[PDB]
């Protein structure tokens, strides 16, 4: 018999992105080649099958630094990290291949889906 | 020129509630009289003006235990904590006064609003 506040989940995510921008309570740095991205492990796990697996691991759960595969593109990761915290995906002709490859590695199925559909439309 | 995934914020919140249920990466215990509630500081701050103030404080940000005012009702807190993690508010005739008082203390304006409207309708 609960009532539900429609905008609550979006409002929570907006405040989680504000915390990220101010570097408040971030507990991990994701290293992608020469670039570093600070984030909250809980948000990363909530968005990505890869991070969910990593941070449920009894040893990796305590690491402050995670190094991604050297094939991962930093811009592609940046775009996906922004998506995690905002629901908005900056998908462009010039970045779609990197975004899709990064989303496959991060196991972000909905992003992979749409990248596949946008690529199919251009061929 | 971003695209947006409509269900993303709800999906994130669902996974944050799964983390809470499994006690994964919880970093604080909220003590309400004889009861204890484990949570994630980032979610508490994202939902509550009181916790936002507490956890941005340069000393309180590092506490693992927060004790609420002894006038706070544990069930009212439980209902609001569930709301934080689900967008669903279990508002009942028998708990509305406790929920509204707890929401005022926690500075959860939308919950206070609706409690006020539900009370006004019954008088």
């Amino acid at each position: 018999s609960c009532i539900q506040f429609t905008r609550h989940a979006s409002d929570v995510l907006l405040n989680l992105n504000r915390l990220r921008s101010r570097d408040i309570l971030t507990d991990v740095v994701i290293v992608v080649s020469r670039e570093q991205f600070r984030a909250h492990k809980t948000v990363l796990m909530a968005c990505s099958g890869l991070f969910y697996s990593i941070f449920t691991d009894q040893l990796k759960c305590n690491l402050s630094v995670i190094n991604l595969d050297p094939e991962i593109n930093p811009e592609g990761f940046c775009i996906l990290l922004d998506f995690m915290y905002t629901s908005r995906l900056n998908l462009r002709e010039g970045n779609i291949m990197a975004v899709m490859a990064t989303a496959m590695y991060l196991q972000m199925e909905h992003v992979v889906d749409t990248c596949r559909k946008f690529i199919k439309a251009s061929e | 020129s971003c695209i947006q995934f409509t269900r993303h914020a709800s999906d994130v919140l669902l996974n944050l509630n799964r983390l809470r249920s499994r006690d994964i990466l919880t970093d604080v215990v909220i003590v309400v009289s004889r009861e204890q509630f484990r949570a994630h500081k980032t979610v508490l701050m994202a939902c509550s003006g009181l916790f936002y103030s507490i956890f941005t404080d340069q000393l309180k940000c590092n506490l693992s235990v927060i004790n609420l005012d002894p006038e706070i009702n544990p069930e009212g807190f439980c209902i609001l904590l569930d709301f934080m993690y689900t967008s669903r508010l279990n508002l009942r005739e028998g708990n509305i006064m406790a929920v509204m008082a707890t929401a005022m203390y926690l500075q959860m304006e939308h919950v206070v609003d609706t409690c006020r409207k539900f009370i006004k309708a019954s008088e």
């Binding site: 609960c2 009532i3 539900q4 506040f5 429609t6 | 669903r88 508010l89 939308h110 609706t114």
Partner: peptide, 4 residues
């Protein structure tokens, strides 16, 4: 607020 809505009835979900």
């Amino acid at each position: 607020w809505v009835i979900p």
